[PDB]
């Protein structure tokens, strides 16, 4: 898949807004993911004991990790499709060390789109959401292809 420059502009326009508060968006996203799909929490050995959203909101650790995730995703989106080098080390740790199925990447894709829709309605109308969805589908397709080369699958 290939996004047009107009689509990348809609994606980087709303991402510039997310970058005004990276830690808050990171938090929102991970909590949304853990509440919606609680099975995903079991993958994190560092955060699986968290019982409630209040506990999640108060974890400093969880918040730092949300900044780590979003910084890594933001550096990929800014490449505008030329992200091969960035994807390599991310695909190798998530397929070999963390063991994250593609289905979970779909779940966090959904969580991103939910949070952007709630925090940025004006910059996340239907065309912008379609371009963000296209950018994350591209990311999942490329990561699934790398998963295959690395030997992870199902
Ligand atoms: C937008 C998609 C994602 C991005 C960009 C992302 C990125 C990261 C980054 C940069 C790290 C630290 C470096 C490394 O271990 O590779 C990381 C660690 C990790 N990731 Fe992801 N990730 C994504 C989705 C997920 C999903 C969906 C799960 C599980 C449901 C997951 C589980 C983990 C685990 C278990 C760690 C280790 C956390 C800790 O250090 O203990 N990741 N991820």
From Swiss-Prot:
GO terms for cellular component: extracellular exosome; sarcoplasm. SUPFAM superfamilies: Globin-like. Nitrite binds at residue 65. The modification Phosphoserine is found at residue 4. Monomeric. The modification Phosphothreonine is found at residue 68. Its EC number is 1.7.-.-, 1.11.1.-. Monomeric heme protein which primary function is to store oxygen and facilitate its diffusion within muscle tissues. Reversibly binds oxygen through a pentacoordinated heme iron and enables its timely and efficient release as needed during periods of heightened demand. Depending on the oxidative conditions of tissues and cells, and in addition to its ability to bind oxygen, it also has a nitrite reductase activity whereby it regulates the production of bioactive nitric oxide. It is found in: Cytoplasm, Sarcoplasm. Belongs to the globin family. Pfam families: Globin (PF00042). This is Myoglobin. O2 binds at residue 65. Keywords: Cytoplasm, Heme, Iron, Metal-binding, Muscle protein, Oxidoreductase, Oxygen transport, Phosphoprotein, Transport. Gene3D superfamilies: 6.10.140.2100, 6.10.140.2110. Heme b binds at residue 94. It catalyses: Fe(III)-heme b-[protein] + nitric oxide + H2O = Fe(II)-heme b-[protein] + nitrite + 2 H(+); H2O2 + AH2 = A + 2 H2O. It comes from Physeter macrocephalus. One of its GO terms (molecular function) is oxygen binding. Its main location: cytoplasm. GO terms for biological process: removal of superoxide radicals. Coiled coil: none annotated.
């Amino acid at each position: 898949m290939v996004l047009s420059e107009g689509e990348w502009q809609l994606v980087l326009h709303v991402w510039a807004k997310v970058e005004a508060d990276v830690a808050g968006h990171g938090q929102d996203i991970l909590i949304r993911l853990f509440k919606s799909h609680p099975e995903t929490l079991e993958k994190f050995d560092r955060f699986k004991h968290l019982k409630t959203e209040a506990e999640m909101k108060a974890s400093e650790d969880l918040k730092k990790h949300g900044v780590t995730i979003l910084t890594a995703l933001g550096a990929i989106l800014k490449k505008k499709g030329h992200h091969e080098a960035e994807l390599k080390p991310l695909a190798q740790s998530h397929a070999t060390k963390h063991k994250i199925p593609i289905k979970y990447l779909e779940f966090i894709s959904e969580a991103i789109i939910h949070v952007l829709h709630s925090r940025h309605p004006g910059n996340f109308g239907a065309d912008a959401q379609g371009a963000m969805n296209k950018a994350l589908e591209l990311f999942r397709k490329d990561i699934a292809a790398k998963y295959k080369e690395l030997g992870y699958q199902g």
